[PDB]
Amino acid sequence: GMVVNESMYQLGSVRSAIRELFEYGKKRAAIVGKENVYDFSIGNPSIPAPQIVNDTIKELVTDYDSVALHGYTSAQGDVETRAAIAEFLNNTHGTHFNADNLYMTMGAAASLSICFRALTSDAYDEFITIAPYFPEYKVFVNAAGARLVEVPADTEHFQIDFDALEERINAHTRGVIINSPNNPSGTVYSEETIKKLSDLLEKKSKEIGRPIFIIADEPYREIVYDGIKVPFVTKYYDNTLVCYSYSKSLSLPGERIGYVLVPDEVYDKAELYAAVCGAGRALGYVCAPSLFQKMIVKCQGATGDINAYKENRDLLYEGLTRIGYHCFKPDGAFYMFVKALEDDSNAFCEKAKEEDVLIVAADGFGCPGWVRISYCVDREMIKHSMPAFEKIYKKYNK
Amino acid sequence: GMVVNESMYQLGSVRSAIRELFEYGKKRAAIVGKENVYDFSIGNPSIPAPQIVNDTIKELVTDYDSVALHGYTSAQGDVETRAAIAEFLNNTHGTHFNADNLYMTMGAAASLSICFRALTSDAYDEFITIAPYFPEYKVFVNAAGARLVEVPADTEHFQIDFDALEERINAHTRGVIINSPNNPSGTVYSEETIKKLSDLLEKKSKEIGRPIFIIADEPYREIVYDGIKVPFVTKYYDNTLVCYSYSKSLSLPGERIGYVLVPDEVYDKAELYAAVCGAGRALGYVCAPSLFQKMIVKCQGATGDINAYKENRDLLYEGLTRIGYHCFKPDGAFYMFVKALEDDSNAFCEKAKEEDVLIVAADGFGCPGWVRISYCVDREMIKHSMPAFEKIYKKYNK
Numbered sequence A, B: 001g002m003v004v005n006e007s008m009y010q011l012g013s014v015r016s017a018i019r020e021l022f023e024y025g026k027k028r029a030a031i032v033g034k035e036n037v038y039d040f041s042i043g044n045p046s047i048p049a050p051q052i053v054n055d056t057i058k059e060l061v062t063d064y065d066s067v068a069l070h071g072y073t074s075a076q077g078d079v080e081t082r083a084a085i086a087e088f089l090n091n092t093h094g095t096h097f098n099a100d101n102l103y104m105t106m107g108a109a110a111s112l113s114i115c116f117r118a119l120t121s122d123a124y125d126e127f128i129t130i131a132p133y134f135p136e137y138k139v140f141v142n143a144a145g146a147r148l149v150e151v152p153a154d155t156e157h158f159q160i161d162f163d164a165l166e167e168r169i170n171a172h173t174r175g176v177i178i179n180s181p182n183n184p185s186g187t188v189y190s191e192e193t194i195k196k197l198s199d200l201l202e203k204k205s206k207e208i209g210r211p212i213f214i215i216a217d218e219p220y221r222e223i224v225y226d227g228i229k230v231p232f233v234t235k236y237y238d239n240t241l242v243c244y245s246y247s248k249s250l251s252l253p254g255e256r257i258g259y260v261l262v263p264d265e266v267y268d269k270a271e272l273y274a275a276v277c278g279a280g281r282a283l284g285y286v287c288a289p290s291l292f293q294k295m296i297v298k299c300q301g302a303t304g305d306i307n308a309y310k311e312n313r314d315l316l317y318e319g320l321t322r323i324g325y326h327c328f329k330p331d332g333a334f335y336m337f338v339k340a341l342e343d344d345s346n347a348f349c350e351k352a353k354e355e356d357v358l359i360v361a362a363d364g365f366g367c368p369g370w371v372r373i374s375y376c377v378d379r380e381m382i383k384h385s386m387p388a389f390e391k392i393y394k395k396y397n398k
């Protein structure tokens, strides 16, 4: 007896465990004070955009012709915006992109949606995610009419279990989603991992008579520490689509600006780029926000104070390790992956909750027995949280 | 078959008549000079935004906290933005909306997309459009997994042929799309047309045992001349979804800011609003652009100089009528609907194309024998085009 689409109703009515945890912390702040609530739940950028963002926005609003500034760009975005990104990427990675290899989008969620929508031709199409993973991939894959296949986590190094991956590749496999630097683990795939992946997928692509794409979800690319290198995947694998946004690099998550990069070395660039444009059109996208496209021209290479996040990583890692917790030291992103004190991460997160430590069970990310602790938080809160972490530890280790 | 989704391939590679006509005019401008080409093809806002827009953007970037200014909003948008709109609508129309009746979107294309995706539950679902109509409705309807049904135009008054509409309503009918003020006719539906529509749909909804919605595409609401009233549809029919954007009112088409309005008076507001939230999520939307949501709070009821468009309407109408063309005098939008000089509009537009006058055959809008002439153009170009229009007229009046 439902007038609306049931999947849409479910997708809009489903309560987010993480968001509820965030709102629970605000309710707890009212009772015990915000200084006494240790909220490591939601993964929102916490450092301000570099000053070039606000300075450039001010300049466009003051000096750029208002009709031209606020008008529709082409579907794929201004050629000047696309040209500036192609040239920045070539100077940084040694690639050979031009403006026409880019399609400007309204953030990474739009870029991913476009990729699955462009690549899905059948109800039985499968996209592979490597656990632990961003759960919203299932919504985007399902929204395109396809299905998600999870590769069990490499809990030793948080790279890829290639045996497990190879076993889940079949005739229905359209692509493999990778997120490096990673949400939730903070892992960074090495050149070796990227090369083995590329060799495996090239080999399986030939066996099935069809390209298996790499869908590279790269919004944390510049959120990497200690000189660790994030390899540019298009250089290793021909059939690679790159999804990027300025949500983390420039701290503009609410502004909705990113891209889909379609290399010339894909099986048929003209055809795939056409499907990307068509998918964008089908999803109700007309163009990326014009003000932000024009602003991005002057912000290539610019990032916020990334060392603020590194300092938080080191502080949290040092304190948790010193207490006795087993933390995976992350090379990128702003999430720390910590082993729960019991196999049941949900039961462990409840015990954490008893001391107002709001951490997230990794079961939903495809990783039971672990938790995700976001450190895009206030540095002083991390220090004030240590006695509560110590007390939580004591509950298990008397 | 094809490696990508073929339907997405075709959507991204098939050029529209209007776009292909605009490209032709640029090539022609290179050969004979832009002064010798009179382009009335594309319908993009030609007047600047009111100064409050740019002033507010400077203010927000200068004074508002950077992290909070550029951060993610809730999926439905800032409560302050939604509340300011709800209050504006109430003061203007006598309605009783609150913040929770609104969902902020990335333009009217997103608003429309969301409405169709929310409602569609079977492949054979039908959404009715009243010819002449915005051809992109077919794209949004098809992308939602539904079929578009056309009602032939009322070529006497560009209101609605109710017998024709009634005949096309059946068990699959999920909604009727209305667009007043209208692209491409410039018609404004009267209070009576809206009342007759509401009556018909109430009866047919009961007959089929399910609500049939009015999807009211409203981006031209304020582009209305001579004090003509545009009735607020939710006061006439309970099951009404309003899709709006600030693309035409504030001249921000490239910025991607609008909304979907879900009245409490729909059959079940909680269910429908949850479906709208679901569809937004499934379409890859996260939030409308933060900066612009924050800006919209201070721009309620603001518009650019709409009198500039009226002066072009009057000049074009009086000029073409004087020559001998039959023009439907539009009450809103910035498109003039003119009867072709022969039955074949395409053949007529080719004869116009001989004299470097670029006008759009109404066949693609579902209305053969007419043309759309966009007047969101330079005023002096309208004046300079008249000898060419008369020369075109003289080809048929021998």
Ligand SMILES: Cc1ncc(COP(=O)(O)O)c(C=O)c1O
Pocket: A043, A106, A107, A108, A109, A110, A134, A179, A182, A183, A217, A219, A244, A245, A246, A247, A253, A258, B286
């Ligand atoms: C792995 C991953 N991909 C994509 C996104 C979304 O980025 P955007 O704000 O550009 O949509 C996020 C944040 O939720 C993320 O953590």
Ligand SMILES: Cc1ncc(COP(=O)(O)O)c(C=O)c1O
Pocket: A286, B106, B107, B108, B109, B110, B134, B179, B182, B183, B217, B219, B244, B245, B246, B247, B253, B258
């Ligand atoms: C009738 C009609 N509806 C919707 C739109 C889309 O407006 P927006 O750019 O806000 O998506 C347009 C303009 O292209 C239009 O003419």
Ligand SMILES: [Cl-]
Pocket: B138, B142, B146, B147, B148, B149
């Ligand atoms: Cl159809």
